[PDB]
Amino acid sequence: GARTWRFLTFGLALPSVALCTLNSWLHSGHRERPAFIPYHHLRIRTKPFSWGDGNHTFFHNPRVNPLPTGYE
Amino acid sequence: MFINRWLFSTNHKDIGTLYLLFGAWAGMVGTALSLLIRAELGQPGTLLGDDQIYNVVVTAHAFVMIFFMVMPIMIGGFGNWLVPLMIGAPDMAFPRMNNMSFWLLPPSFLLLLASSMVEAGAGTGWTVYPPLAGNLAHAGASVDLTIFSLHLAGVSSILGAINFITTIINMKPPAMSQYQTPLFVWSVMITAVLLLLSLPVLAAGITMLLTDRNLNTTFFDPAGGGDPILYQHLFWFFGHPEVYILILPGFGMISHIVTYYSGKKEPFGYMGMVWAMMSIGFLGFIVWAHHMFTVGMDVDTRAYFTSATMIIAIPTGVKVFSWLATLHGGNIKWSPAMMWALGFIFLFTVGGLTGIVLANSSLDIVLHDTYYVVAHFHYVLSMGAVFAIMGGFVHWFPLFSGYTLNDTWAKIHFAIMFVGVNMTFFPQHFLGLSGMPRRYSDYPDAYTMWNTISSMGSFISLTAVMLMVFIIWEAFASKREVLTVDLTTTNLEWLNGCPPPYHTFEEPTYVNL
Amino acid sequence: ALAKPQMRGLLARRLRFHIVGAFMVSLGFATFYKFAVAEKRKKAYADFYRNYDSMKDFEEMRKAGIFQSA
Amino acid sequence: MAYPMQLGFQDATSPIMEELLHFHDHTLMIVFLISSLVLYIISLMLTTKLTHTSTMDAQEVETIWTILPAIILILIALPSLRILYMMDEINNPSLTVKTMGHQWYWSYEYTDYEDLSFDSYMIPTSELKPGELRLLEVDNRVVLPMEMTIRMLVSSEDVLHSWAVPSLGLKTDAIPGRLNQTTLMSSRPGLYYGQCSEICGSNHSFMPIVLELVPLKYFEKWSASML
Amino acid sequence: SVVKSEDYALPSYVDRRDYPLPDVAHVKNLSASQKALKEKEKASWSSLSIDEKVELYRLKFKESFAEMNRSTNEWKTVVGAAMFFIGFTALLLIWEKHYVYGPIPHTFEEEWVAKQTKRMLDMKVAPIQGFSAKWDYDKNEWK
Amino acid sequence: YEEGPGKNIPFSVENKWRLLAMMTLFFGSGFAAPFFIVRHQLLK
Amino acid sequence: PSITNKRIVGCICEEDNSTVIWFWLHKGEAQRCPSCGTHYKLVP
Amino acid sequence: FENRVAEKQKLFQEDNGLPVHLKGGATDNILYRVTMTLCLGGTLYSLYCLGWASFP
Amino acid sequence: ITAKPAKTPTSPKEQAIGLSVTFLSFLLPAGWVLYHLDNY
Amino acid sequence: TDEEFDARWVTYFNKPDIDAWELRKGMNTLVGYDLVPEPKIIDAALRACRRLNDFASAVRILEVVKDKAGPHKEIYPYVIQELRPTLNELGISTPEELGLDK
Amino acid sequence: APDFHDKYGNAVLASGATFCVAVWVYMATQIGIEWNPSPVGRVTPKEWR
């Protein structure tokens, strides 16, 4: 019945979400970025991207995404 | 006629009565074992022998108290008597299979007493860890007899769980939803689901122990690539749910007793109480490795088991506060059953809170395998499960028998048992913090005062148990027949009189939508 | 003639008064416990180790004859 | 070691044991408060002739009943898990010592440099020297350097045992086929006692642990003398 | 009014302060004078005597509120009997000490304890709070 | 089958002294058993 | 309906009440639920 | 084969007061007596075996 | 609860006998074993 | 609101043809609430007892007013004061006047 | 009319209390039980070496 599925929604499902939200909001501080190494299997550029200067990924984050030549 | 009625029963009430008789006898065995423990520890030195005879007594104490006293009384006895009556059902779904759940227990008990009589007994602890429980360190039949005892008790409870779940789901009045069944009925359905899922895993683990002992398997033997710690995971995957199995029906009886003696038609926050019991049942499956904080698991695993274990305090707190809110505004009747229930609320709370201390893996390093654990579990078992049993017994004895107890004697019994259990277990906290290990026949001299006081406590509890036998005798001896019972409008189990006829609800209740 | 007394909500009024009473007490006990147990323990350990001389402690033990190795 | 009429933990010998004492004080204050509040509320519910027996609305009050306990558990969990991870932190030990559990005695191996090993048995009650402790003394103590990070590795050659020293905050299970690690650092010289902490048969009560904590120079000379 | 076991399914009488008007009268059967009293009750209650009003109350109800709510001396019997059985328990413990327990170990002898106490102070057992902390090493006495 | 007080049980309560004897044997045998098991284990 | 002169009624006085009110309904004049006053009449 | 369920319905509904485990006739009594004799006799033998195994 | 008076009243003397017999049924057999432990 | 609650209960007991079952249902329901009923409610219940020729239930209603006040000893004598005109008019003796407080 | 508690309560409370205290004091002090109290403020330490 609707009563049972509402009981599961508020008594189990949303409490789970609240606990995982608390878990996440406790491990949410920025990780220490690793030394840049210009590995040939990463930062692939076979064709320029069709936006910006051609060299930045779509959701480029300056803090954690280095370019082929290193961190900005 | 006697054989047809008592050996061939298909009647939920008579089977309930057989379980209560079995459990009461088991409680006397478990009490005697508890007094041998405390006689050994009541002065420094050795009374009986070395740790083997001592741990045979400790192991048997636990198995008898858990498998032959608490589970048969709560589930087999109160569950069979009350569940059909509380839902207006004419019997259990499988009334003949019900009788086999009962008749498996005398043989189970016989195998346990055989374990103790052959060779040097099973001095393993109730956990039966290898390699001490293996065929080198426990050569001979004792551990195999213990395993087979557990197999028969396991089948008894699995078939009983199938019976209760089916009865509670399928045999209510057609207008009655699950959200119109009494809390005791919910407490038995949830306990039955825990049994159905947990006991097969125990069965698998003790079967592996049996084959390591007799068929040259090496599940738990490093020489064959096995791991003693795998046994611990399988055992505790069952063992944590088992403690919720031991308390849940007690929570259900406490809800009924507090409601009744508060003069209320209903417990406070019914849906919260259902939510709390289902939450405890679920969380009880994902916490087992809090029994293994010293075995060498990874830190992140210890962090998870600490956190998941503490979460159980939230639903449990809702129940404690809901019991207090049921008392609030009551016309309080200070019956013996009410005294048991009020002692339950307080003493269960203390033992729950020492459980929360133990849930902290860092602190559990120092408390594990110490008397602090023994203090925790005797607050929740010897003052929680037992207080719920005694409350339920004095409340429903007149329903089952048609006779009244002497209330003054029952209040005397409560007062003696309250003093004895607190004198026994409160000082064990001090012994645990200061480092006294579990499963010791003797202790360094520093631990003498608290062990002396604890043993004196156990003798006060013995005096309560002896008086209880006399109180039951006096009730049957005097034959005061029940006339009227209050609050039948919200306590259906009383509405067919005391005792109810052999067949009740031949014509079912009328409930419209 | 007698004055009209409060006749409604007497149980609720008693509950409200005493639950606030229990909260205020809980705060008094926590302050007491902080003082008599928790801080006393931190100060006992801090004061013991502030000028503690582990070599002098060892020398006293050695001279008392407690050790297998010294 | 424990002393007569002791109520709480043995005094801390290691910084982690100090941390566990302050964490226990914090937790026990909470246990005392909740225990007290429940007893007080029982007593308040039971001490009035005023009644209210009609249906009572639950939802408002159930918010308090869940949120306050959730906050209290977070206040326990935070320092609990800080200490868990502090014990797990990388430290660089100066020394590794192994202990093997047996029915019913401990063996010790110090094999960083030389093959030093010996057995450690309980002193029988009839052979105690005046002043010595029943069930706690051993013939051969575990001599160790004070004020140094030591790696202790624990196993068994038969059934389960458990190697415990309460004043250092230590308890590590001794499992055949498994090498369990813990770290030991004593702030002080002295004698520190523990007892086997896993049921292991007939003489489980009678296989204790005695650490003897001394300056490095004394430990080195003892080591040499034990070869 | 005689209450029968075989009446369990019928409305019954209760004295409960939370159920002041129960489902039946305490007394259902009326004598000739009680029938005349119920007829008189249909006229002005001012014309009933105090005795007639009490008789009408006692036909309707068994106990008054004052009677049903009364205190009892039961606590004396419960506390006294509990103390008797706790005292009896001490007899069992005396029996156990006399006939079951042998001597305790020689480590409890007064001279052993005096020497063990000094050795515990020499190894500075619990020097921060528990034990050696309570000894004055300067004055050679307990603080 | 007999119904009612004292009839819905596998033991008789017709005579309170015969009942005392039966209850003594029943609870007494459960309490005694562990002492006699310990005696048995000590006598090997 | 009943095959005898009395039957137990359970009254769920309002939709989704968790509390059921139980009473014997006897042959004769309609009786009322003691919680909500709903009328019930036995038809043997 | 032929459908003889109606003849078995008549036999098992006969108003003779027999419990269902004996209602097929004399063969049920025999198989009941064999079963109960093996169970009770086997249980006595298991008790003798415990007696034996309880001593060295 | 209400109840009839006892159909077979148990006098104080009868209660003292029942209580005495009950206690002895627990205490004598255990007592016999514990008294004889040294002999075992 | 308080006035609306009190008006509902006055109306309940004032129904001219109120029956014995309704009188009991009313008082047994009313004493479940966290209050001592206002004199105007008690007045209407006592007049219902009169229409039902039930002197005993009128006395019992006065007892349950005292009981609902618990330790607040000032409430009952206040309510009796307010009811004196009705008690005099209907010839209702208090439990105290009948010795039913002993 | 006076019940068991009215007639005997005072005597049961006084006798039970007196008996309980007397027998527990005798058990605790007169039969050689070793309580092993704290030596602190009680025991004069004595040379052991």
Ligand code: HEA
């Ligand atoms: C009925 C039996 C029972 C019950 C219900 C419990 C309930 C709990 N137990 Fe326990 N336990 C045992 C029986 C039981 N236990 C046994 C037998 C062992 C030993 C097994 C062996 O080794 O032999 C043991 C061992 C055991 C351990 C292992 C310790 C060790 O071996 O080192 C731990 C670890 O976390 C644990 C914790 C808990 C917790 C957190 C609860 C929780 O469910 C308690 C929750 C209750 C409350 C918290 C109280 C009420 C709540 C409130 C009033 C709300 C407010 C509270 C807070 C904000 C904290 N118990």
Ligand code: HEA
């Ligand atoms: C339900 C479970 C339960 C109960 C009730 C008890 C009750 C008691 N327990 Fe025990 N105990 C355990 C489960 C239980 N125990 C477990 C699981 C262990 C661990 C085993 C292991 O380490 O492997 C243990 C271990 C244990 C130890 C630790 C041993 C060691 O580590 O060396 C001690 C020490 O004092 C002890 C003592 C007692 C005492 C004195 C009682 C007393 O309180 C008992 C008093 C008597 C009763 C409470 C009456 C019982 C009877 C009834 C209720 C019958 C009712 C009759 C009717 C309803 C008709 N038990």
Ligand SMILES: CCCCC/C=C/C/C=C/C/C=C/C/C=C\CCCC(=O)O[C@H](COC(=O)CCCCCCCCCCCCCCCCC)COP(=O)(O)OCCN
């Ligand atoms: C937030 C939740 C999810 C959001 C979904 C995506 C948002 C934008 C685009 C939507 C379409 C998505 C479909 C999958 C296609 C490819 C890439 C999308 C995945 C994405 O969004 O990936 C991004 C790259 O997007 C890129 O390249 C840019 C992508 C934009 C152009 C893509 C063009 C290609 C389209 C292919 C169409 C094929 C359709 C098939 C039809 C089949 C019928 C038979 C990742 O960012 P990044 O900076 O590299 O790394 C993060 C560093 N901090």
Ligand SMILES: CCCCCC/C=C\CCCCCCCCCC(=O)O[C@H](COC(=O)CCCCCCCCCCCCCCC)COP(=O)(O)OC[C@@H](O)CO
């Ligand atoms: C080392 C050796 C140890 C082994 C111990 C062995 C234990 C016991 C011996 C087993 C003897 C079994 C005899 C047959 C039992 C049949 C049960 C049955 O079939 O029970 C049915 C109900 O269970 C149902 O359906 C569904 C459930 C049917 C279950 C069947 C029996 C299972 C037996 C063992 C189960 C263990 C579980 C394994 C998982 C761990 C029928 O219920 P009744 O109440 O009879 O009738 C109701 C009437 O309306 C029918 O007309």
Ligand SMILES: CCCCCCCCCCO[C@@H]1O[C@H](CO)[C@@H](O[C@H]2O[C@H](CO)[C@@H](O)[C@H](O)[C@H]2O)[C@H](O)[C@H]1O
């Ligand atoms: C260490 C744990 C020890 C537990 C101690 C147990 C104490 C035993 C109490 C028995 O004493 C009686 O208790 C009654 C209740 O049981 C009281 O009822 C009286 O008081 C109540 C009001 O509080 C009312 O409900 C009753 O109507 C009224 O008669 C009665 O006067 C009193 O003598």
Ligand SMILES: CCCCCCCCCCO[C@@H]1O[C@H](CO)[C@@H](O[C@H]2O[C@H](CO)[C@@H](O)[C@H](O)[C@H]2O)[C@H](O)[C@H]1O
């Ligand atoms: C209807 C009720 C139930 C009927 C109960 C029947 C009980 C009688 C069984 C006969 O007893 C047998 O005796 C043999 C001795 O003659 C044993 O042989 C075995 O033990 C021998 C001991 O010498 C060895 O030869 C071997 O292990 C092996 O042959 C065997 O264990 C045992 O069963």
Ligand SMILES: CCCCCCCCCCO[C@@H]1O[C@H](CO)[C@@H](O[C@H]2O[C@H](CO)[C@@H](O)[C@H](O)[C@H]2O)[C@H](O)[C@H]1O
């Ligand atoms: C944990 C549960 C047990 C708690 C303690 C039990 C309390 C004791 C009850 C009395 O038990 C008896 O004590 C007698 C001694 O007082 C014993 O007689 C023994 O001692 C007598 C006196 O020396 C001799 O005359 C007898 O022959 C001899 O058997 C007797 O056998 C034994 O049954």
Ligand SMILES: C[C@H](CCC(=O)O)[C@H]1CC[C@H]2[C@@H]3[C@H](O)C[C@@H]4C[C@H](O)CC[C@]4(C)[C@H]3C[C@H](O)[C@]12C
């Ligand atoms: C929705 C469900 C059933 C309601 C009903 O149909 O009667 C109710 C019953 C118990 C309720 C829960 C319990 O009261 C415990 C929690 C209380 C908090 O205030 C909200 C979340 C919380 C987890 C509740 C969510 C939801 O309201 C639950 C789960």
Ligand SMILES: C[C@H](CCC(=O)O)[C@H]1CC[C@H]2[C@@H]3[C@H](O)C[C@@H]4C[C@H](O)CC[C@]4(C)[C@H]3C[C@H](O)[C@]12C
């Ligand atoms: C002839 C007989 C008719 C059955 C009937 O309707 O009574 C038939 C119907 C289906 C047959 C069975 C099925 O055809 C399947 C099997 C086929 C094999 O070749 C013989 C055995 C076998 C198991 C058959 C035995 C028997 O001949 C059955 C049972």
Ligand code: CUA
């Ligand atoms: Cu080794 Cu216990």
Ligand SMILES: [Cu+2]
């Ligand atoms: Cu657990």
Ligand SMILES: [Mg+2]
């Ligand atoms: Mg362990």
Ligand code: NA
């Ligand atoms: Na001992």
Ligand SMILES: [Zn+2]
């Ligand atoms: Zn209704």
